[PDB]
UniProtKB/Swiss-Prot annotation, chains A, B, C, D:
Enzyme class: lyase
Listed name of the protein: D-mannonate dehydratase
Catalytic reactions of this protein: D-mannonate = 2-dehydro-3-deoxy-D-gluconate + H2O
Subunit structure: Homotetramer.
Any Pfam family hit: MR_MLE_C
Family the UniProt entry places it in: Belongs to the mandelate racemase/muconate lactonizing enzyme family. GalD subfamily.
Any one of the GO BP annotations: carbohydrate catabolic process
Gene: manD
């Protein structure tokens, strides 16, 4: 059989850090996968380079499922952010190889096209309501159909930045943002809000109810969800739609949230949750309960992830929306890709594979630089959820 | 305030790989913690050295809870084998410092002594029933009160070794081991069996029922438990006691298994599940339902973990048993410790701290060497659970 | 081992009755604990002096957990207000000794500091809405961040005083208090209300809904809770936050209220619910469901309890709020302590122990005087819940 | 109205300690009630003498329900062993007065006679199986229809005595006792066993199954029951009948055990659980699920309790059995009573009241002497349940 000859980790920082796995074969064809774990990147580098990659040498890269099961089960210690990023990188690279060998863009292998373009949302941010309202208008004018709106709250504020938070101040202020947005722009546009893990379940229920008159597309990550019962009170009390899951890494993180009908959108991603192989299983479970996909799409997911995400989004029947933050020009140059943006939609191209590659010579000119996600504390100093 | 000046990772292989974190302070006192993750060790090295440790510099090491919450919440991507090993290492080192500063052995700070010695079990292994029966006898003769018995099954068989498995062959053979053990040795000794994740829930129910006449201390890890509902059928159908959790890393992995009364012993460890700080919370939840601790204790948990485990075991009210595999002489020399074994019990000493230290000069003479856990496949080649 | 030489009960009335246990040792170090049970004080005196204390003589006071289990299990008749006050007094005294021996303030032994100051609420009372609104303003002006507001209701009224109650009159009046408070002071301040056990579950649901526009911090003790299902209808029908538990004495009183997510704040105290040892277990169970601590803090909890409560509050991750009623000057003199109040927050000091002591010579100058809590009856004479 | 003039506490030790309340009135009629709480007796003395009794002076003793509610609700701190003993003593004394005033034995006021004699069980104890089998035979020969059988286990062992325990040793031995009893005496006699709180739920399930061939009348107190879910696994796994509740003090301790059909007999008593008034409510809830009464009846319940218990047992429709341990001759002389034993049954007499009185002059000749219940520890020293 054809064999894996190398599984190499490539690190680059063209505006921010990205980690990529390149699986090479004895036939010539290669595939690439994203391994980026924002703020903990080098843990995945080691997991791959020192442990997983040596096991892959000599394996048959056509055996996507077997290799997935080998790395998942064979680890012994199962699941987790680092573990699943490594598995995702392998899986993306193997699907890239499979699609190249089939002479087809990846969405064709998944079951073909279900839709034309992929609806996105962008990020309208402001320091206060007035600034945020202005920002949403600029996104509307750019042709976005859906916009996430986030405001700073008056009275709230190389190593992690420490930010402040106060729930009462936010509960008193956030609903007024959405009131003003609907007064200014009407109800035609999809409006989204990220609760950023800040609220208890009762508080999220309160906030959800206060947001009902404004017909939100979703309220996201309203309360920490390691306990999958945490969404129960929220769902009982509000008809504001709920989303969660960018930080999830396996179906086991979401099975009860889905089966108990506690969420409307699942936000797990190709890189976060174990590749195309595993994300398909999450989306299928979701579909049984009419839960839709809402893949996370911040810049810390490389263009390799975005290419795979768009192939996935183009096929998956229960697609909801795709988050889109634009990468830097330098990032786009390091990772040439066959997808594009037009009038509020992303489109994947027909290049065999997932359509993304990496320019290794150029990537080597942007050295790794440590960078951390911020943390949050309450006014009294209590460590909180950022 | 006193400050952390360094948080250094030390790697050594005195018979097998161990990773240790040493937290140093500007007062002079230091603490150490185990970070060893068998078969994925260097992923934790990177998680600590490249990401967590730089954040700890300048922090007040007296703030154990705050630092735990900072590393747990501040990671953004929560839980997981690598993540929680890093957190455990920090937590052990900080409790070591706290106990040293208090001038007390660690168990005193946890609430003091609940018992004298710590009951252990050892591993009696054989290639067939006859060999396994002989091995159990040797453990009995050595004064062990509790013995795990594992047999090879006739017809079943630097990089991971690939082993074979067949469930029907095992279901036909394993119960006969326990029949023979009770015929030979009677019912005085505690007898344990590790199902090694091999069975479905229905199969584990079947096996559990077949083992009932032999009054086992536990049947462990009978079926994979990422789905916490997996133990439901087993518990419904058998009164053989059930244990699980060496591979768990947070309370979120076990909350339903405990609250639904699906297990008798929780096997999570100080190193696996986030240190003394977090393991206490797991044990307390367990206690509400009369579930007892049965900490895993294989050699891939360093003597630093064993010292912390024994301090924990000496205090915790709902102690059940402690697994004990003896380390090599070289490992014992690299990690001098104040605990000892006598007549089937471990005992922790009175040295302030957790009682363990690391000889860095000696540790440097045993270089890291890659080593992997085995994997298992069914007879047709299907990737399985080892 | 070091031994308990005496466990002495001290009674004093420096403005109101307090009972204190002092555990003395053969090394010299001693510890003190609160045993005060308002309106039934001498039952605890007897429980301790005639029964528990003689068993403690000769025990090793370092064995906090063992002694807790001995007094809890060994009583045979388990739980209860008198029983648990006795256990709490012992536990506080033993933690006081442990912290003194460690040379650390108590919060350090619990896991260290999670926050700086401790947010409190005070009691704004009035005979009608106008008077109550004035009182809340005075608390705001004094720098309180949180205020409990209680009003008399027009038409409602050495041995226990008999008070009157009528639910319909209150349901028609209480919501107007919170309407007026928000009209007058806005939404910046945390506003609390104690329902004083007066309502049925349906009535509490009704009241909770009527209070929703006013964004309360909590509605407390809305309905009697011996039946832990009593909060179910309330939680189903309102997003007003719920608190309960000042009269609870073990985790068994609260486990279902917590696990079924029926409350936002648990109000159990160090003295009410079995000391630091047991209150930690309650707080930890609460944390799994994002339930926060809201310890009761009326004057019938002595400064010994307040010191322990503040050490607990300084460490506990899921802190919510601390009730604060100021003791008399005479009480403060009898129980010198290292905690203080500034701008709406309490702060614990660094004195080893819980930081509180008792001046026995001064305490002896204020003799015990019987005093009872009031009772309540409905308009027709029916015995009710005060 | 007629008034309570005194409510006096009388203490005596005619072989063991008893506490009695005597309520006197301005008409002349008086009533007495048991307040005995074994091993904590003087806590109830204080609760009554220093707190409750002064509130009763001047009340109308005909108002049994109102006084019950006053002492129960008015305490503020609700339920508990000490609290409920005090309430029980009052309630018994008031029912005694009511029956005297009606000119009827107490059972007539409860609803009249449902049966003739009251089936009892006695205690056959032995140090080993042979001795226990002999003891059961002596009870059979004395005409007992029902016998509790308790054996010591080989290998198991003024201040509380410390006893030993080991679960595995007992699980290996106890079933053989019942095997031998059925071999020797056949199946005609009711055979009972008290598990003495020693087992976990899984262990109790195991034991229950092992006892099935021997057709026990009940297995009692198999596992601690503060968590009312503790009986769930036991009930799921065995058809051996289950009993619990001698240590319960309110219906709130038993409501879920009853409604979830986890027990066959409720063992709460007139003295333990708040008098005739409250025990009636427990028995009625039990009856809905065909659960029967099995009142505890050890010697630490005075003849005042036994008289009330027998009046209750004579009326209650869902009577199951009454425990009977004979008091000393001296105890019988101090508490003259109208009940008697014949051929395995107790009978209550027709004396108006509950039929019991106290000879105060004689009682004064037997002074109080401290005496404690034993405690139990596991072999390693762990504090356990006696
Ligand atoms: Mg987000
Ligand atoms: Mg194992
Ligand atoms: Mg209150
Ligand atoms: Mg009993």
């Amino acid at each position: 059989h054809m064999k894996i000859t190398a599984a190499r980790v490539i690190i680059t920082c063209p505006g921010r850090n990205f980690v990529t796995l390149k699986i090479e074969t004895d036939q010539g064809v290669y595939g690439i996968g994203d391994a980026t774990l924002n703020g903990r990147e080098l843990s995945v580098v080691a997991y791959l380079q020192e442990h997983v990659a040596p096991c892959l040498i000599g394996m048959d890269p056509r055996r996507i499922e077997d290799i997935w099961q080998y790395v998942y089960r064979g680890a012994y210690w199962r699941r987790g952010p680092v573990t699943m990023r490594a598995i995702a990188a392998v899986d993306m690279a193997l699907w890239d190889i499979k699609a190249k060998m089939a002479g087809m863009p990846l969405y064709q292998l998944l079951g073909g096209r279900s839709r034309d373009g992929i609806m996105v949302y962008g990020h309208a941010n402001g320091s206060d309501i007035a600034e945020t309202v202005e920002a949403v208008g600029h996104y509307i004018d750019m042709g976005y159909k859906a916009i996430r709106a986030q405001t700073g709250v008056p009275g709230i504020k190389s190593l992690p930045s420490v930010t402040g938070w106060d729930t009462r101040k936010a509960l008193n202020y956030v609903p007024k943002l959405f009131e003003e947005l609907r007064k200014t722009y009407g109800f035609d546009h999809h409006l989204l809000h990220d609760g950023h893990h800040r609220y208890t379940p009762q508080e999220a229920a309160n906030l959800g109810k206060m947001l009902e008159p404004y017909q939100l597309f979703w309220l996201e990550d309203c309360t920490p969800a390691e306990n999958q019962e945490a969404f129960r009170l929220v769902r009982q009390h509000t008809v504001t739609p709920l989303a969660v899951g960018e930080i999830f890494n396996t179906i086991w993180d979401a099975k009860d949230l889905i089966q108990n009908q506690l969420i409307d959108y699942i936000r797990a991603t190709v890189v976060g949750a174990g590749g195309l192989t595993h994300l398909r299983r999450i989306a299928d479970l979701a579909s049984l309960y009419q839960v839709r996909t809402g893949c996370h799409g911040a810049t810390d997911l490389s263009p390799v992830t975005m290419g795979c995400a768009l192939h996935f989004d183009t096929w998956v029947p229960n697609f909801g929306i795709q988050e889109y933050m634009r990468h830097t020009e330098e990032t786009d140059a390091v990772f040439p890709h066959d997808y594009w943006f037009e009038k509020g939609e992303l489109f994947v191209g027909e290049t065999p594979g997932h359509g993304v590659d990496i320019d290794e010579e150029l990537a080597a000119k942007y050295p790794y630089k440590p960078a951390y996600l911020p943390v949050a504390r309450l006014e009294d100093g209590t460590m909180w959820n950022w």
